[PDB]
Amino acid sequence: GAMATLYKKAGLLVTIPLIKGPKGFGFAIADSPTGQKVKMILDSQWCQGLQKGDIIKEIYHQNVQNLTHLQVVEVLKQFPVGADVPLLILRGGPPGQITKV
């Protein structure tokens, strides 16, 4: 309703509690005009709550907005299987390589 709609207009910062699965965190990111954007959810069990279109702002409380696509991929890849990694994303609000992570 009204609240959900207004939160989409305003934007919402959401912390997603990632757990690294055997084949990664269960999603793919696109190097988009507006940052590292979630392109696909591949296995939601490892990234509960994460949605297509979410934009990565922090990894493990570190701001990653100055990192490149390849650097963000590299940092996510570095975590060992089973690792808990808080992921802060921006969802909605005032508005090409794709890599599995």
From Swiss-Prot:
Record PTM text: Ubiquitinated following interaction with HPV E6 protein, leading to its degradation by the proteasome. Degradation is independent of E6AP ubiquitin ligase complex.
Expression by tissue: Widely expressed.
Subcellular location: Cell membrane; Cell junction, Tight junction; Nucleus
PTM annotation (Phosphoserine): residues: S32
PDZ domain boundaries: 15-91
Role this protein plays: Acts as a scaffolding protein at cell-cell junctions, thereby regulating various cellular and signaling processes. Cooperates with PTEN to modulate the kinase activity of AKT1. Its interaction with PTPRB and tyrosine phosphorylated proteins suggests that it may link receptor tyrosine phosphatase with its substrates at the plasma membrane. In polarized epithelial cells, involved in efficient trafficking of TGFA to the cell surface. Regulates the ability of LPAR2 to activate ERK and RhoA pathways. Regulates the JNK signaling cascade via its interaction with FZD4 and VANGL2.
Record family assignment: Belongs to the MAGUK family.
Further facts: MAGI3 PDZ domains are used to design peptide ligands that bind and inhibit PDZ domains.
Quaternary structure (record): Interacts with ADRB1, FZD4, FZD7, PTPRB, TGFA and VANGL2. Interacts with unidentified tyrosine phosphorylated proteins. Interacts with ADGRB1, LPAR2/EDG4, GRIN2B and PTEN. Does not interact with HTLV TAX2 or TAX3 proteins. Interacts with DLL1. Interacts with PRRG4 (via cytoplasmic domain). (Microbial infection) Interacts with HTLV1 Tax protein, possibly affecting the transformation ability of Tax.
Protein name in the entry: Membrane-associated guanylate kinase, WW and PDZ domain-containing protein 3
Included range, full protein: 576 to 658 of 1481
